[PDB]
């Protein structure tokens, strides 16, 4: 039964954890908006071998995930859960957090994402050979940009994305339910203070984030089967642990 002071402390603790574990400054991301990949640079990315592009993307994705792990470690209550349940929440939720965090690096006006120094459209990622997944991800980020999240809101939202009591294989499900509820309290508390509770009904259905993650695992299966050596030799071992079957 967390008091109003406990809830207010949980809000500040969540927003601090988030500020400290972002790979990119929001000030830089908006500064680089005019910096967009040229028609020649896009063609270069499109003419990369599949293995090279996958390798690059898997590296950058793993990097972002390392920041998500750090976010989890500083998240109030996460380290209080048992070891097994930390693993489960992170394994299922790491990619989900990154997909949400992506909207900070996403420009709605020209439908571009900040990638390897500049902004580019989903056309950049054609050498991956999974255009349905890429465009799905760009659609998801575009829907989040319509919500006009502030940093504090993303912080509180991504915390709820991570702490999800419905993940299969939780050893102490009830302890997870209690922390999830408190973070919901923290979320609703901050929103109501800012007159922003109207976004709650506009939040993506939880099955959409699972679907994107399922889609990623499947596209890795297609790639790993065609290129098993590349994944074994070059891919970050964390990426293989989290996403490979």
């Amino acid at each position: 039964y967390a008091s109003l002071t406990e809830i207010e402390h949980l809000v500040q603790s969540v927003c601090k954890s988030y500020r400290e574990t972002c790979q990119l400054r929001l000030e830089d991301l908006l500064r680089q908006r005019s910096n967009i990949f040229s028609r020649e640079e896009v063609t270069g990315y499109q003419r990369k071998s599949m293995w090279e592009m996958w390798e690059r993307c898997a590296h950058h994705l793993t990097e972002a995930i390392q920041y998500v792990v750090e976010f989890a470690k500083r998240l109030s209550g996460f380290m209080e859960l048992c070891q097994n349940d930390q693993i489960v929440l992170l394994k299922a939720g790491a990619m989900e957090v990154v997909l949400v965090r992506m909207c900070r690096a996403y420009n709605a006006d020209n439908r571009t994402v900040f990638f390897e120094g500049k902004y580019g459209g989903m056309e950049l990622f054609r050498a991956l050979g999974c255009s349905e997944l890429i465009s799905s991800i760009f659609d998801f980020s575009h829907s989040l940009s319509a919500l006009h999240f502030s940093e504090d809101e993303i912080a509180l939202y991504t915390a709820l994305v991570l702490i999800n009591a419905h993940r299969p294989g939780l050893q102490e499900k009830r302890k997870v339910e209690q922390l999830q509820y408190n973070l919901e309290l923290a979320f609703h508390h901050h929103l109501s203070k800012t007159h922003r509770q109207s976004i709650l009904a506009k939040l993506p259905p939880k099955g959409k984030l699972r679907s994107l993650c399922s889609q990623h695992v499947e596209r890795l299966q297609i790639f790993q089967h065609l290129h098993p050596i590349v994944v074994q030799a070059a891919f970050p071992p964390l990426y293989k642990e989290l996403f490979s079957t």
Binding site: V69, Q86, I87, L90, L238
Partner: peptide, 8 residues
């Protein structure tokens, strides 16, 4: 596992 290692 690697997740275990990163969490201590």
């Amino acid at each position: 596992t690697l997740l275990q290692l990163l969490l201590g």
